[PDB]
């Protein structure tokens, strides 16, 4: 309800498309915008998708986002070797009145 | 656009933390701009601390409310964070982040500082 | 054509008749964006494109605005401001060879997604982490196009469907193509409401005795009263006189 | 729809067989349409030789590959089949057959020729 | 594996139903369509059933087909005296990549 849950591992292979899920609730993810971050080890995270479908300037086209009801998805096309890092959800929760985050997914390419 | 945190990195328990994010490239007098703070334990998920808009609307994390005080010094282009009653669980890294305008909706956490590893021990 | 090298065609300067489409097939997919199919036969457009190609079964859903997939991502993308119709029907009767039809191929790998209505044909070897091999296997160094493998026994989800997309245009149109404007048999000697090629009026029509020059279509007496008209079908000249009226 | 075979019916061993199927009622330019060849020894079962779809996909019998060449001459509405190194075991009847579309799946061998008894002897 | 096997004789009697078997393998009859031909002495064969259950226009109803796993069957009802001829199987074998045939069945009415 108040914490977003992501599966921990993705494990694709180059040139393939993969998806990362994020389940929220009626109160935070289904009535607010969903952000999507990414943080290689030892470095501040960096925005990838805000407002559920828009990319800040400087992100390749292959990253796409989607929100639907109470679920969220990130679609990575052209999987490459420079993308194995952590992926986080983020959403504003009206019932808690604060930003909440997810666990994170590994996404190690083979 | 750049941000950078600074302060004391080591403190005994039951003391208070002060941190100062000095930035360059934007002013907390324009519309939109606001600055927030976000902490992350070592090897865990992120956690949101506090936020301060341009008209001084100091939103806080409720569970950590009654402990935090964020304030601005716009003349010096710097923001100050303060947290009392530290404990060994609060060893973490603290980032200062920025929210400016986008193209049809405000952007949040678009730019980050570089963190400041804080250890609470003796 | 195969989907990665689809074939555009223009249709202009005709009297388009859309009453032939329905008689073609049960039309597994027939949906229209921006127009209704029954009210289609009466409007006029500038230039009408028709884009035809062949795809799999479970991908017909990707031919729609704003849908990200694999063929709507790499080898056929249509705008979010689309206006037209799509028509797809199952043609397992004519495209499925026994053993596999490796003649319908599709792009599987590309560097970036493509702009709307863009086509690319180059079959250059795809990029890998490091400098690709050479049109050969390797760590990645893949090859872009991939076949389909249609066979007669596949389910109706991997069976071949033929799909044609119609695109219209409407802005500042010295209209070139509309529908057929049906006519009706002529009535003579009776007070009748007539509509001759746009000229509307009332009166009884009588066989004329005046010599219209071949490029003229209307006749006028003094004070702009339309006195005569030539039939647009048989070119006989017809006289117009207002039916009887008066005071009592 | 009609088919008819023609060529030399008798040839010594170590020679080459040529056959020509001229047809009527379909064209190898439409989709679907294709033409094939099938031989049958005297009193034995049928055997598939080769096939050629409308887009020129010259499928061959693998075991008889490296011996067969099938080609079409669409201008004359005729197809030519060729098989080298004939032997007395290749005495059979050769039909040219037609594969068109059906109602939910391609039809194969719906219409046949009339055969051409081929004897390989001296 | 690479050859379909049929019994050489059927030997029914008028107005009766008889069955003709066709045994294949995992690679050809269990994963492709099964045709059924009928060749009379001194004449090209003539299609009877394609796609395991469909009859080309011009064949009586009494002919029925059935596929089950890696075996095949043709069902002839109302057996008559004008049907004594050869019946052949045919199926495409992916492992051999060619058309393969069966032995043939006699089916002589008494």
Residue numbers in the entry:
A (entry chain N), E (entry chain K): 1 to 110
B (entry chain O), D (entry chain L): 2 to 123
C (entry chain A): 348 to 595
Give the original sentences from the paper that presented this experimental model.
Elite nAbs, mainly derived from the IGHV2–5 and IGHV3-66/53 germlines, showed potent neutralizing activity across Wuhan-Hu-1, Delta, Omicron sublineages BA.1 and BA.2 at picomolar NT50 values. In this study, we used single-cell sequencing technology to isolate hundreds of monoclonal antibodies from convalescent patients of BA.1 breakthrough infection and identified dozens of elite antibodies with NT50 values at the picomolar level.
The BA.4/5 S-trimers adopt various conformations when bound with antibodies: TH003- or TH236-Fab-bound S-trimer complexes adopt the “1-up and 2-down RBDs” conformation, while only two TH003 Fabs can be built due to structural hindrance from the neighboring RBD. TH027 and TH272 Fab-bound S-trimer complexes adopt the “2-up and 1-down” conformation, and TH132 and TH281 Fab-bound S-trimer complexes adopt the “3-up” RBD conformation. Group 1 is represented by TH003, TH027, TH236, and TH272. These antibodies, which are similar to the IGHV2–5 germline-derived LY-CoV140415 and XGv26526, target the conserved solvent-exposed outer face of the SARS-CoV-2 RBD without directly blocking the binding of ACE2 and can be categorized into the RBD-5 community. TH027 shares the same IGHV origin and is tightly bound to BA.4/5 S with a similar binding mode to TH272, with a longer HCDR3 loop at a length of 15 amino acids, resulting in a larger BSA of over 800 Å2. The HCDR3 loop of TH027 forms more hydrophobic interactions and hydrogen bonds with RBD, mainly contributed by P102, N105, and Y109 with N439, L441, and V445. Moreover, the light chain of TH27 also contributes a larger interface and forms stronger hydrophobic interactions and salt bridges by W92 and D94 with V445, G446, and R498. While TH027 and TH272 have been escaped by BQ.1.1 and XBB. TH027 and TH272 do not directly block the binding of the RBM but can tightly bind with both the up and down RBDs.
